[PDB]
Amino acid sequence: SMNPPPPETSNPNKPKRQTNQLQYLLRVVLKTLWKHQFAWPFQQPVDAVKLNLPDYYKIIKTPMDMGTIKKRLENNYYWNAQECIQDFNTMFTNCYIYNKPGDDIVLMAEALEKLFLQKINELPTEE
Numbered sequence: 485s486m487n488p489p490p491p492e493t494s495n496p497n498k499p500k501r502q503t504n505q506l507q508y509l510l511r512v513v514l515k516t517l518w519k520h521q522f523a524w525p526f527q528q529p530v531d532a533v534k535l536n537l538p539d540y541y542k543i544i545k546t547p548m549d550m551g552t553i554k555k556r557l558e559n560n561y562y563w564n565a566q567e568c569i570q571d572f573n574t575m576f577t578n579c580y581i582y583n584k585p586g587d588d589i590v591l592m593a594e595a596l597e598k599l600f601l602q603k604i605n606e607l608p609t610e611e
């Protein structure tokens with residue numbers, strides 16, 4: 485069994501910004517989801533070897549996880565809030581694509597996604 489390389493968190497070719505919206509995505513949105521009792525399956529790339537999911541990266545071609553998002557936010561990888569919001573939505577969508585409805589992992593993704601939506605509902609206007 486083999487895991488792919490993780491999504492990149494570093495790319496000096498990619499233009500970067502520190503916006504008040506991206507500051508909110510780290511300080512409020514990522515912080516809120518990270519501390520949740522159901523965060524742990526999403527805090528790092530899916531380990532398809534240790535979890536015995538040999539088909540995971542046959543089905544999920546755009547992997548994303550909060551470990552990667554945390555590194556991207558801390559290392560100012562993003563140009564805008566939409567890039568980071570897309571990463572969160574990719575993470576939730578991957579969970580629903582791969583897993584069965586009502587599986588524990590899907591209930592955990594649903595709980596985190598509800599909090600995500602409550603926090604980005606109050607994403608501040610750009611300064």
Ligand SMILES: CNC(=O)c1cc(C(=O)NC2CC2)cn(Cc2ccccc2)c1=O
Nearest residue numbers: 525526530535537579582583584587588589
């Ligand atoms: C993003 N994570 C996953 O998609 C994932 C998939 C499966 C899994 O076995 N999925 C098969 C398709 C049912 C198992 N775990 C561990 C786990 C963690 C928490 C509760 C139950 C299981 C995961 O984290």
